[PDB]
């Protein structure tokens, strides 16, 4: 009887930040209460200040990345305040059944509801809203993020030794549709109503206008950079809901990779680069050998460069020149 | 000699339905002979009326799901009749040289020709047209399928434990690019020599109007919606000859996977979302444990719910609360 | 001490060739050192005689394949000749640290540098420039090439034993982003800086006006196909720096692939397609089993056959009519 179970509740981080929790299980089987409230607002997504209406989870692009074991039961309020506009839903790829939660999860605005279900596969998985009729939208407006689901015993290497990381990071990719008239401007809406066939319209180029992480260009680079220290075993749990991406580390590997995100398998080994399908969390470990600054980019640098999608760690301690060095530096 | 070996001959069935078949190899070898009349002929492919002269195997898009086990023979009798323009011929991807059985089987209207080739590799395969100097133009026209080389002692999981199927499903996904005019309706055209130049240049756009399962829009919903009751195992093979994919059975899971097809490498496992790269087929091993309706899209939502990539599931059964449950309905 | 190893001083080799070298390591670590001279260079890309302005590393595109072992290390003098007129660097996908040699190695015409760094990693690799800004410019423009970090003891397989091939290819694919005007004709610049933001606005369309295999329409066809012998063990490297694609050998397969080009995971078995992530360099190794003209491509087949993705082998040997026969040969 799940009542008979202890009951956790935990209060979500902004990503790429991610809430507390214990890679191996300390205890048996919970239910983990989560409270998400919905939020449509603008966001400015560009250094040319372009601004969009986003529509969030808990506040942020992406929403939050949600932690539990396997075996756990995922317990979610979902709050649509009346200041939101919009019916919205929620779909965990994590859940079986009700398309995710979708059937069981539309709240109009000034509703709330409460899903529970059982995370019975481990791994990372997207979570995103998906109203009948306006999915894409919905999802390409920013209404996603992730849920990870680790083994009672943590995660292992492709030898079934554990592995265990230092720090954790949650990048959200997303790609945005901003319309554009004939000239190639980006074109301004009154409501939603208003809006969405032009959104429809620029969906259907297939070409993104922003490539982001962490909702914005540039947010995770400067103040916002993720941090790390020569030694430090990180993961990076990456998402993209709706489109292919090839993360890639800068000067780094993906040490151990789960390209697709889900650890009854086997980690990729020394991966340069790895593709996450549109409608997948990836995940990958890697300890870090230099200081110094690293670029973490979709590696269609384009996406990365020009689109948006690259952000910055910023690692301290020891130079080792074995690994590498300047025998001649540039001169003429 | 293969003279000496039995043969049986298959009668094919439309997709996404597929011919009887054994999974645990009940003879030895065999020569097994399919015959395949190609269909010039027009489809509406989306719910607007639009309308395309389709290229297709035994009349429909996709062609029908081919079975065999390895180290059978497939001897195939590929009839061009004199309704037809076109010059067509076979390459498939499970075959050993000749460009997969194109540069033997070019036949002009009117023509007919028998290939027969040694299936030495066990997975699912695409099998398309392609002849020279027209090889796309003839894929996205529809003129392609699937072919499934079981190994002989059936499928196995990624422990060497057998996995057997209930039910099987061929998903043939299809990329359409009807040209556009400057204003962006659909062109219209007179022949095939007429239509060539501009259908490529419409395909030279990278961007397809249409994608769609079994040759429409909706083609895969309402009374041709897939079934299945819950406990049932469901194999779904998925094609995609010319671009990528990345299948997703909302409110499920991939059980196990080939993501790229081929029955010789361990599933990888509890997939959300799987990359089948264009020019392959992929298969999915699902068992149901929710009732209800699930759609099973391309999750690039875009390209599923807007351009066609989307069909459905009705399953029938008890549902279970503890896997998933509302807690609390919508309310205000 | 570095300063006790043996120095081996490779020269290169123009793709799709590979310099020598031993798969097994017939001797300890050593410093295997590199020269590459920087050429800024017109280039015909197509039959039509398009002409852009090309960024390459030793003069082609791709770049050349280095080849050393792992725990070797690469000594890379990158010489920027004063004809050039850009500052240029170099990245290893394959390095740790100052991404991947970018932040060591940046120089203006007229000046050189060398770099050191460890193969700790076993795979093939990308490697390419990436100067801050500019990026994408110069990867689009040609600047990228791969190397592969044998194991010591040289390939395995899936099960442990050894692989060994008998020929080797790299096959660099480039993606061109040609800018076009209103008509859609290419646009043509008379200098890099005046060149640059039209190259921006065409990258950003993120649709290639060309898609080649060593650096043109039709560079390995005829004279210049790719050979082999029926029962030759080939290796195809295979890297995509920007973009991704699904390499195809049209009646052939993929016997054993890494397609994220990594060693010391197990290869995929069988493969009739792979995803090769941009950013990424793969691996297939094929035994040939039939003499004859096999094209080898990219299997989004727009991509091949208008875009220019799509190279040849020509094979010579005996014809295996047991693997495949013509039946009955086309006939009215
Ligand atoms: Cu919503
Ligand atoms: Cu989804
Ligand atoms: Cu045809
Ligand atoms: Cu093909
Ligand atoms: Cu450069
Ligand atoms: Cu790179």
Chains 1, 2, 3 share one sequence.
């Not at 899903?115 to 481990?122: H, I, Y």
């Not at 998906?130 to 999802?139: D, K, L, N, S, T």
């Not at 973490?296 to 384009?302: E, K």
Request: glycine share 10%; charged share 20%; proline share 7%.
């Amino acid at each position: 009887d799940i009542s008979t179970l202890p009951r956790v509740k935990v209060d979500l981080v902004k990503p790429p930040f991610v809430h507390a929790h214990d890679q191996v299980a300390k205890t048996g089987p919970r239910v983990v209460e989560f409270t998400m409230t919905i939020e449509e607002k603008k966001l400015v997504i560009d250094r040319e200040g372009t601004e969009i209406h986003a529509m969030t989870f808990n506040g942020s692009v992406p929403g939050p990345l949600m932690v539990v074991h396997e075996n756990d039961y995922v317990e979610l309020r979902l709050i649509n305040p009346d200041t939101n506009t919009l019916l919205h839903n929620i779909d965990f790829h994590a859940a079986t059944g009700a398309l995710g939660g979708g059937a069981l999860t539309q709240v109009n605005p000034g509703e709330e509801t409460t899903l529970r279900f059982k995370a019975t596969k481990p791994g990372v998985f997207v979570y995103h809203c998906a109203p009948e009729g306006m999915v894409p939208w919905h999802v390409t407006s920013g209404m996603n993020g992730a849920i990870m689901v680790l083994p009672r015993d943590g995660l292992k290497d492709e030898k079934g030794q554990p592995l265990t990381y230092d720090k954790i990071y949650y990048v959200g990719e997303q790609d945005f549709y901003v319309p554009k008239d004939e000239a190639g401007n980006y074109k301004k809406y009154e409501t939603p109503g208003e809006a969405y066939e032009d959104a429809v319209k620029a969906m259907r180029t297939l070409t993104p206008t922003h490539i982001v992480f962490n909702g914005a260009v540039g947010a995770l680079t400067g103040d916002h950079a993720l941090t790390a220290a020569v030694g430090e075993r990180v993961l990076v749990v990456h998402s993209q809901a709706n489109r292919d991406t090839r993360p890639h580390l800068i000067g780094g590997h993906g040490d151990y990779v789960w390209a697709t995100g889900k650890f009854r398998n086997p980690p990729d080994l020394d991966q340069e680069t790895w593709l996450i399908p549109g409608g997948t969390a990836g995940a990958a470990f890697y300890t870090f050998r230099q200081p110094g600054v690293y670029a973490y980019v979709n590696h269609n640098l384009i996406e990365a460069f020009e689109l948006g999608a690259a952000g910055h760690f910023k690692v301290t301690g020891e130079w080792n020149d074995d690994l590498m060095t300047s025998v001649v530096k540039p001169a003429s």
